[PDB]
Design a protein around this ligand. Structure first.
Ligand SMILES: O=C(COc1cccc(F)c1)NC1CC1
Ligand SMILES: O=C(COc1cccc(F)c1)NC1CC1
Lengths: 237, 300
């Protein structure tokens, strides 16, 4: 059924699974109109679909043109998410199709289940984890490809860069969620932490900087601090 | 007016004949029920005094043969049977009537309740839901499961209601996933009405039979089926106007007849609130919404 702390190691077994986060699919800026009314303007979005074991990220970019002339866009966005995830699964060879899809928001369950009626062996699951995947657009290179897109487009990334050469997927996911939590709680501090030192670069083919093992521990500690911090500043503790 | 005679009443039992119920005491001189209105299906059901567990009963139509009830001390229940010898039956019934050992079906002449609950119920269709083809009458009890319930174990003792499942390839057209899940008109009108039921009368008749099975026996799967068939209409943007008008009448009399004490177990809060307040047809069930709100405002 639902996914929580009791079964956190299931993510890193050998059953193919994908997380799907739809929080950045329908994005808007809200503004005043000349008549003093309020209007929205949509901007490009993305479906964040991620294999937590391999780090493979199927970033489906949602171009604003898909909303043209449509009604109830927050609701359409969920079904559009489901449609595009269903399309991805169908494009993958059978031995690459997930055995489970885990949705980060419960409102995605019915839209995805309906789109995947053709795949009755694929389990559609919620989670009780509060995962920070909405902060994916704080990753500069992901944000860049979404905002530059002029048409619908799937871009493939490895959100772990080369980390799996040195650490396990359990540790790689925990780093990723720590980084994304930090970016979500205080993006500027998080980004300052990551890029303060000019001598640690981000390789062209990577998303994150080329930290050594020792540097990652310092970074990880600095991001923990940030998250405990902002939690004070928030709750005055 | 027709008669269902009883050989005897050897065990204390509450006997029902449609919406009416009476108590018969162990070995009381009871020999059946008379003046039963022709033209309607009927149900005679029993709850033994000793074991309130397993209310059971018999759907039947007096036009389809001469039916009597006899207690079976081996199987432990009141069994319906058919008498083939018409002359023996007339003679047996006349003897019982002369000695006044029968209760009279007690219909008030103003009262259309039973008609209104059974308007579209036909014995021929009942027998396709309750498969026991050697008998003209159909047995139902509390514990009988439905075909869909056995998909989620004895196939012969099942209620073969039409399977309705909103998240099914039957209900959802490829490429219309969102359209068809949020507006079930395709499933109601094309799949179910045009495809399976053929007309709204068959649809309504199953719906009414499901309700009566749920209300009389506490048959849980019947209750599920009645609610599903309401929801399938309420969740369709496009429903013929006469079907909605009739549905409002149907439900009105079901809710009116519903005994108050079983309202919590026979009424699904989620379905009713959705149908009355959120669904496409939220404004289309004036009579039903009015009685529901004056009788069971708690549910809403
Ligand atoms: O037992 C009976 C009695 O059959 C009836 C028929 C009609 C009304 C009634 F009270 C009883 N017949 C078969 C030969 C054993
Ligand atoms: O006869 C009954 C009561 O029948 C029962 C009995 C026991 C549990 C239950 F759910 C229903 N109702 C209709 C109006 C005459």
């Amino acid at each position: 059924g639902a996914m929580n702390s009791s079964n956190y190691a299931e993510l890193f077994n050998n059953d193919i699974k994908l997380f799907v986060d739809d929080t950045n699919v329908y994005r808007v800026t809200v503004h005043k109109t000349f008549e003093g009314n309020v209007a929205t303007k949509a901007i490009n979005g993305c479906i964040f679909t991620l294999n937590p074991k391999t780090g493979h990220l199927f970033l489906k970019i949602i171009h604003t043109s898909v909303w043209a002339g449509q009604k109830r866009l927050s609701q359409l966005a969920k079904w559009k998410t489901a449609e595009e995830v269903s399309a991805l699964v169908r494009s993958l060879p059978k031995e690459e199709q997930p055995k489970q899809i885990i949705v980060t928001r419960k409102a995605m369950l019915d839209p995805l289940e309906v789109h995947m009626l053709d795949f009755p062996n694929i389990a559609i699951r919620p989670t009780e984890l509060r995962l920070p995947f909405s902060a994916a657009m704080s990753i500069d290179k992901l944000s860049d490809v979404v905002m530059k897109a002029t048409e619908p487009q799937m871009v493939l990334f490895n959100i772990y860069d080369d980390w799996l050469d040195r650490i396990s997927s359990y540790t790689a996911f925990s780093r990723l969620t720590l980084l994304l939590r930090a970016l979500k709680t205080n993006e500027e501090s998080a980004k300052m932490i990551l890029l303060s030192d000019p001598t640690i670069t981000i390789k062209s083919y990577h998303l994150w900087p080329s930290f050594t093992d020792e540097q990652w521990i310092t970074i990880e500690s600095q991001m923990r601090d940030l998250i405990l911090t902002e939690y004070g500043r928030k709750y005055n503790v | 007016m027709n008669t269902v005679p009883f050989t005897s009443a050897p065990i204390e039992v509450t006997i029902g004949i449609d919406q009416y119920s009476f108590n018969v005491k162990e070995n009381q001189p009871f020999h059946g029920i008379k003046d039963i209105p022709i033209g309607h299906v009927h149900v005679i059901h029993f709850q033994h005094a000793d074991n309130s567990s397993m209310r059971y009963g018999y759907w039947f139509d007096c036009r389809m043969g001469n039916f009597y009830i006899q207690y079976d001390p081996k199987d432990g229940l009141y069994k319906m049977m058919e008498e083939r010898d018409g002359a023996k039956f007339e003679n047996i019934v006349h003897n019982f009537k002369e000695r006044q050992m029968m209760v009279s079906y007690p219909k008030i002449d103003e009262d259309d309740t039973w008609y209104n609950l059974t308007e579209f119920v036909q014995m021929d269709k009942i027998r396709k839901i309750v498969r026991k083809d050697e008998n003209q009458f159909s047995y139902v009890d509390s514990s009988m499961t439905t075909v869909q319930e056995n998909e989620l174990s004895d196939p012969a003792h099942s209620l073969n209601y039409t399977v309705i499942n909103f998240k099914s390839r039957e209900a959802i057209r490829p490429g219309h996933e969102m359209e068809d899940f949020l507006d079930k008109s395709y499933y109601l009108n094309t799949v179910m009405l045009q495809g399976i039921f053929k007309n709204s009368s068959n649809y309504f008749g199953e719906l009414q039979f499901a309700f009566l099975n749920a209300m009389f026996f506490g048959n849980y799967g019947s209750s599920l089926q009645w609610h599903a068939m309401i929801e399938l209409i309420c969740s369709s943007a496009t429903v013929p106007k006469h079907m909605l008008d009739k549905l409002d009448e149907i439900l009105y009399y079901q809710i009116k007849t519903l005994p108050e004490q079983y309202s919590d177990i026979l009424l699904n809060e989620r379905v009713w609130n959705i149908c009355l307040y959120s669904s496409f047809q939220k404004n289309s069930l004036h009579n039903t919404e009015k009685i529901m709100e004056n009788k069971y405002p708690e549910l809403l």
